[PDB]
């Protein structure tokens, strides 16, 4: 079993000792060697076990029963500091000192789409065709970046252009081509990459790369489970709240209730005052987790886009189609439909156009071959010119 | 909606105007600088009542710059639209994205998404209009609309109207 | 006349009101959240956004304009950013006052250890100056070493 093995009062104690950084495993090996050497002698090292954890830097934990045993184990070592920096580990901490780590995900799944940390395809989305059993590397499906004779743009490996620019192409199978030492399978590069070269979480996909990857599958983006999970993650993480926001509750006993955010504490507890026909209920403040709150957007409110192609665009709400909200823009003066997850009720725009485009305000520019004008107002997407 | 409000203005006068006609000059300066202006807080100031008998008080000399500062209090007629208000209008332009009406000095834009569906935009009609079987709204046509949202600018106000509810549309 | 024209009216300070900054106000007046310890992005100019040298905080270079106000170096006053703390910590300047406040109130019900029923307590509350008022209230409530769940009738204490 596993539950029954939890420690008791009569179990051997655990001590932690500060040591010099980077020598923890060395101290562990020295302790084991000393225990083995003195095992079977008149004065054996009266300890039971010793270990360390990578996260808990500078600490080595020994399971024993006596402080003299700890002193004897540490006697003759140079990594131990001058002072006896030893402490008694609390019995409750015994389970935590040996609990595992990095259990967020079971494994890297073959066929999943991931981003590359570094290399020539730094940041390019890649499909995990193969996961090596070692777990340190994995073979991936990528879009080649070649010039055929500062990196070239990603493009499917073209055998005809490659032969024209380099007639030394090699062939091993049908559809599997090796050019310049790189193996391209049906126009897609297949190359092993280390685990330290991949981002397996918070992956941001683009429909352009998705289409370029799924075109060979005879259907545009047939696989959408991992994409749906990424959508859920993006929707959940992008939500940020402020006092005074009108929100609705999705779960809990208070489901389908409206309220206004009164105060914000940390990023997971939000104090909300609820609104209802009963006056005595409207005078109560409730702290509610943010994971069960949805923003309420009323028609005719100034709202600013948080994230997306229309970032920093503002306008007035016109149509509320549930998840997707429609609003008339201010700069383009046209209706734009964006999800309610990307909108914040900002009563004032005050948009700054700096660090965008080539021209600033009051710039005398040439409209065309005949018309010359000056800039009166700048936008995130266009400019206004008086000729 | 029109209102009467007691407003105040801070007026700075250059020393070159320190003459016997100081008071009247301050009066015309106030009239030129207030009549017709548009402030988001108040709306539009259309006229100033008793414009020739406004008290200006005693101006204070700004230390280090010589110019005098005057505090002028006056009563003026002010118009400001409110959210959720139904007012009369006259259509000024017809466009596929919607039609623009005028409510006094304010120009209101109504999008197609706030127009009843039966009022299909007819570009072939002369002039082009948003028309139904029994309704035809074109340039110069009286319309009764409800203001839904107001946008505040530096010295301008942008309002959005709707005719999608009852007792609205053509009148 | 050495300053570029601004339409805001020019006035002079008549009162300075002191006080503390609420976390809500700190979050409100901030323009960016500081989270990355690296000062420089990749040591290739353009300091990392979200770091301690975010361009939104303000500009100190002649050829670089502030990304928040758009003004030059001579006009940008600087804009604040905020950093969220994982665990709340003491303000080093208020620890003695925090200790005094802890001595004045109950640690469970969050109420004063004395009430207006005591003539001395009412006399102390009658004073106007906040500092002397706090001093008198502390001098009285310091001796009271136990919360009362009942009137010395329930006074709101937890006992």
């Amino acid at each position: 079993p596993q539950r029954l093995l939890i420690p008791t009062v009569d179990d051997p104690g655990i001590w932690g000792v500060k040591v010099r950084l980077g020598k923890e495993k060395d101290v562990v090996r020295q302790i084991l060697k000393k225990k083995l050497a003195r095992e079977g002698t008149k004065n054996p090292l009266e300890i039971y076990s010793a270990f360390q954890r990578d996260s808990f830097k500078g600490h080595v934990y020994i399971e024993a029963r006596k402080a003299e045993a700890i002193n004897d184990a540490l006697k003759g070592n140079v990594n131990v500091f001058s002072n006896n920096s030893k402490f008694l580990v609390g019995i409750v901490e015994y389970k935590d000192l040996l609990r595992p780590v990095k259990s967020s995900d079971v494994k890297l799944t073959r066929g999943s789409y991931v981003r590359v940390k570094n290399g020539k395809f730094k940041g390019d989305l890649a499909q995990v065709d193969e996961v090596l059993e070692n777990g340190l590397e994995a073979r991936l499906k990528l879009v080649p970046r070649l010039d055929y004779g500062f990196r070239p743009a990603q493009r499917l490996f073209s055998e005809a252009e490659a032969r024209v620019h380099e007639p030394t192409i090699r062939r091993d199978r049908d559809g599997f081509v090796t050019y310049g030492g790189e193996e391209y399978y049906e126009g897609f590069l297949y190359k092993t990459f280390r685990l330290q070269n991949l981002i397996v979480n918070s992956i941001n996909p683009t429909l352009n790369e998705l289409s370029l990857f799924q075109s060979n599958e005879e259907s545009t983006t047939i696989d959408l489970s991992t994409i749906a999970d990424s959508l859920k993650e993006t929707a959940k993480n992008l939500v940020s709240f402020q006092p005074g926001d009108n929100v609705e509750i999705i779960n809990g006993e208070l489901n389908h209730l409206t309220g206004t955010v009164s105060s914000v504490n940390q990023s997971t507890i939000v104090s909300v005052r609820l609104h209802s026909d009963d006056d005595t209920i409207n005078s109560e403040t409730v702290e509610i987790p943010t994971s069960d709150l949805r923003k309420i957007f009323n028609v005719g409110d100034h709202v600013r886009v948080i994230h997306g192609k229309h970032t920093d665009d503002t306008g007035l709400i016109v149509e509320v189609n549930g998840d997707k909200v429609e609003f008339i823009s201010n700069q383009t003066k046209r209706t734009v439909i964006v999800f309610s997850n990307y909108l914040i009720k900002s009563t004032d725009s005050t948009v700054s156009i700096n660090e965008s485009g080539r021209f600033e305000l009051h710039d005398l520019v040439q409209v065309n071959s005949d018309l010359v004008g000056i800039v009166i107002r700048a936008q995130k997407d266009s400019f206004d010119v008086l000729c | 909606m029109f209102f009467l409000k007691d407003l105040s203005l801070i007026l700075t006068l250059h020393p070159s105007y320190f003459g016997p006609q100081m008071n009247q000059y301050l009066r015309e300066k106030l009239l030129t600088d207030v009549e017709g202006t548009c402030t988001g807080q108040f709306g539009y100031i259309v006229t100033v009542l008793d414009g020739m008998n406004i008290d200006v008080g005693k101006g204070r000399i700004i230390p280090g710059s010589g110019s005098a500062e005057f505090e002028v209090k006056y009563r003026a007629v002010v118009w400001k639209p409110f959210k959720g208000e139904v007012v009369d209008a006259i259509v000024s332009n017809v466009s596929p994205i919607g039609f623009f009406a005028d409510v006094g000095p304010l120009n209101v834009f109504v999008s197609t998404r706030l127009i009843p569906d039966n009022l299909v935009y007819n570009p072939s009609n002369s002039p082009p209009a948003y028309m139904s079987n029994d309704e035809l709204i074109t340039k110069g046509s009286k319309v009764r609309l409800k203001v839904v949202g107001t946008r505040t600018d530096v010295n301008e106000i942008y309002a959005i109207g709707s005719i999608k509810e009852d007792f609205l549309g053509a009148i | 006349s050495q300053f570029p024209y601004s339409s805001a009216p020019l006035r002079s300070v008549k009162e300075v009101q002191f006080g503390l900054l609420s976390p809500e106000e700190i979050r409100a007046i901030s323009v960016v959240k500081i989270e990355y310890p690296e000062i420089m992005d990749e040591s290739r100019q353009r300091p990392r956004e979200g770091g301690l040298n975010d361009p939104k905080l303000g500009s100190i270079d002649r050829n670089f304009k502030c990304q928040t106000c758009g003004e030059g170096m001579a006009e940008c006053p600087g804009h604040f950013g905020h950093m969220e703390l994982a665990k709340p910590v003491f303000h080093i300047g208020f620890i003695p006052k925090i200790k005094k406040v802890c001595e004045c109130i109950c640690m469970n019900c969050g109420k004063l250890l004395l009430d207006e029923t005591n003539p001395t307590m009412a006399q102390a509350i009658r004073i106007r100056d906040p500092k002397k008022r706090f001093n008198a209230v502390w001098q009285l409530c310091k001796t009271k070493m136990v919360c009362e769940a009942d009137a010395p009738v329930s006074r709101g204490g937890c006992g």
Partner: peptide
């Protein structure tokens, strides 16, 4: 012959208005 005059009194187009150089006099 075009000059781009800006005035703080004028509100239209943030005070920017185009006027020919032949129709103005030096102040």
């Amino acid at each position: 012959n075009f000059l781009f005059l800006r005035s703080r009194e004028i509100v239209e187009n943030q005070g920017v208005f185009v006027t020919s150089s032949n129709r103005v006099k030096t102040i």
